[PDB]
Amino acid sequence: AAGLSPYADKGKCGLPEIFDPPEELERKVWELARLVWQSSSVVFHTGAGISTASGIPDFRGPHGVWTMEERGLAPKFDTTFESARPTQTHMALVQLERVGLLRFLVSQNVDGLHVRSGFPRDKLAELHGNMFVEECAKCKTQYVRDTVVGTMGLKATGRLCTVAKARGLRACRGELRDTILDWEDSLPDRDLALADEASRNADLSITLGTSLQIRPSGNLPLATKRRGGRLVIVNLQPTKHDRHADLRIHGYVDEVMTRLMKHLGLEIPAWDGPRVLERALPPLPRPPTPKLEP
């Protein structure tokens, strides 16, 4: 958290977790599988809760980084960012995207795991940054790195731009900066615009592991509802937009995505290691029609 503003509003931290009882849970995940299948345009919105299984703390859960700071304590990192492994949720999103069942992914996560899982960059908006990505302040070229860039808050990293310029081939030499927003920084223009278009034209927005307290990210899923679509919120704690959910699921997100993939006859791929993909591969064909809840 180094060099960052100490003036931030941290929101509501430490709310207790709720656990849907198993029968209710199984029935809600069947309903989810149906709306995924019936929906043409499906948009996912992910926050810190989809990376807790990998050892990275959230911000506002019972043991979140903000929650611990309010109460005098430091947080507990089990894993480093470099050694963190994509979860079954991350890998399930790769596969959903492969078979046409995911249109776009909006993430508030700076952990680099979507990118490292193999999720195509062109269907991903990292609205708050990525610890592995630095950007040239002069020509806006991004560099995806294998280790974390070392600064946060849109500061200079100490490295310079290596791009050969269209006329004359001379290195740009612009200042490289981290892409990690501080509190009250402006969101990335293009990524926000794309996340907004996707969210406005969706039939179904599904949120996973966000409490939706931060804007404008936290509000993109409402846009969906505004234009006739449905909204599914999956989170252990309550979320700010609970009252607008068509379907709420209080359970572990790995657990929901495992059952959801079972109900749609999809295999969740294993993760070979960090593998950056710039452009979505050609679609695998839509799956064979899934079976029903007896």
Partner: peptide, 7 residues
Amino acid sequence: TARKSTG
């Protein structure tokens, strides 16, 4: 130029 905040 939308900004990362609570409200």
